[PDB]
Amino acid sequence: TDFSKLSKYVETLRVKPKQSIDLKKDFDTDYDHKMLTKEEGEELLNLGISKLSEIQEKLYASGTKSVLIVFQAMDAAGKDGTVKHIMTGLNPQGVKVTSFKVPSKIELSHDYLWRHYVALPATGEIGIFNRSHYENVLVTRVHPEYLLSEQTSGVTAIEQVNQKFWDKRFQQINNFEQHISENGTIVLKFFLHVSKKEQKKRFIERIELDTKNWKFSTGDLKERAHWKDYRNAYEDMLANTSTKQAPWFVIPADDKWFTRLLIAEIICTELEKLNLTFPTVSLEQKAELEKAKAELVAE
Ligand SMILES: O=P(O)(O)C(Nc1ccc(Cc2ccccc2)cc1)P(=O)(O)O
């Protein structure tokens, strides 16, 4: 069955703990051997959103768990659109998106995890980090001068930054994710993997659409010039922070409907392992219900 074929492909996207990573070679930005049509993918994606909605309702109602979903990607990979698609299927009461911008002055007076810790989901809730704590081994690794504005980083000069520094943040991040995973949080992390070619095509398409044009600010393409350093930082990150307990998935991003299908599928699969059910109505509660109803009929 197609779904079964989809389910098998999905497992190839999970980053194994003791695996090495080459994003050019070991992971696709688009997939040729798609086991379904686009119109089928849209159908299935819609079933996924409804299932996720049922899960969210059960989670809010009864569950002893929280859920944290992380999105990282290069610009124009489809990250915001994906977040938005997932989100509008869900109850706003139980879901919270946090897009972490450049740190505030206050946030810069705490360690780099603090603001992420502060924003964690409460039990019964779903938190989505659109960008995350991982920016601290990505954008700040490509742009290590940013560490000089970090009063907690202990970096007065970029020569001080080396591989041990990054290893040490990887260990911090893992410890953090392990702690929350051992205290009720399900952690799931998605890297939307767009090709340099497709990013260009999307950038040009945005530049030529007058409806979207006004959102461009000076230097929005700067990160594309550091494509290779980002690739490197992503590779090293993915090889050292995917655990069985807090896995990374590398999602091909060059076809958006498919990217969305995959993420919805993985989230459903993973949260289905919690065996969430609605509360059931005991005899005592049943009695109360029938008593309440009799009072209304008798007014
Ligand atoms: O989903 P939408 O909101 O319609 C699009 N978002 C978007 C974000 C930033 C910009 C400014 C910009 C950035 C780089 C190159 C040229 C222009 C334009 C549009 P999209 O994510 O679908 O592209």
169 within 8 A of 176, measured Cβ to Cβ: no
Taking the CA of residue 276 as centre, how many other CA atoms within 13 Å lie in the half-sphere pointing to its CB?
24
Q: How far apart are CA 126 and CA 58, in angstroms?
A: 12
Q: How far apart are CA 1 and CA 11, in angstroms?
A: 16
Q: What six digits make up the tokens of 284?
A: 């005592």
Largest CA distance in the chain: 82
Amino acid residing at 143: H
Where do we find the tokens 């001068």? 145
Atom of ligand 1 nearest to the CA of 80: 21
Atom of ligand 1 nearest to the CA of 203: 15
Cα of 209 vs centre of ligand 1, distance in Å, is 10
Residues 6+ apart with CB under 8 A from 142: 223, 226, 229, 230, 233
Edge to edge, the sheet with strand 185-193 lists 95-99, 126-130, 66-73, 185-193, 248-252
70 within 8 A of 189, measured Cβ to Cβ: yes
Backbone angles phi, psi at 193, to 5 degrees: -105, 95
Residue 245: how many CB atoms within 10 A of its CB? Answer: 14
Cα of 102 vs centre of ligand 1, distance in Å, is 19
The ranges assigned to domains in the chain are 1-299
Strand 126-130 versus strand 66-73 pairing type: parallel
* Residue of minimum CA distance from atom 6 in ligand 1: 212
3-class SS at 24? coil
Cα of 10 vs centre of ligand 1, distance in Å, is 28
Q: Give 68-114 as a DSSP string.
A: EEEEEE-TTSSHHHHHHHHHHTS-GGGEEEEE--SPPHHHHTS-TTH
Q: Which of 215, 218, 222, 256 to mutate to test the pocket of ligand 1 (most atoms within 8 A of CB)?
A: 215
Q: How far apart are CA 234 and CA 140, in angstroms?
A: 12
Using alpha carbons, select from 99, 102, 150, 138 the residue that is nearest to residue 226. 138
State the method: X-ray
Q: What six digits make up the tokens of 157?
A: 């000069």
Instruction: Pick left, alpha or beta for residue 187 (phi over 0 → left; psi -120 to 50 → alpha; otherwise beta).
Output: beta
Strand 95-99 versus strand 66-73 pairing type: unpaired
Where do we find the tokens 């990250």? 79
Residue 282: how many CB atoms within 10 A of its CB? Answer: 9
Q: Give 185-233 as a DSSP string.
A: EEEEEEEEE--HHHHHHHHHHHHT-HHHHTT--TTTTHHHHTHHHHHHH
The distance from CA 264 to its chain's CA centroid, rounded to whole angstroms, is 11
CATH architecture of 1-299: 3-Layer(aba) Sandwich (3.40)
Q: How far apart are CA 257 and CA 46, in angstroms?
A: 11
Amino acid residing at 234: Y
Q: What angle do CA 147, 216, 146 make, to 5 degrees?
A: 5
Resolution of the entry in angstroms: 2.3
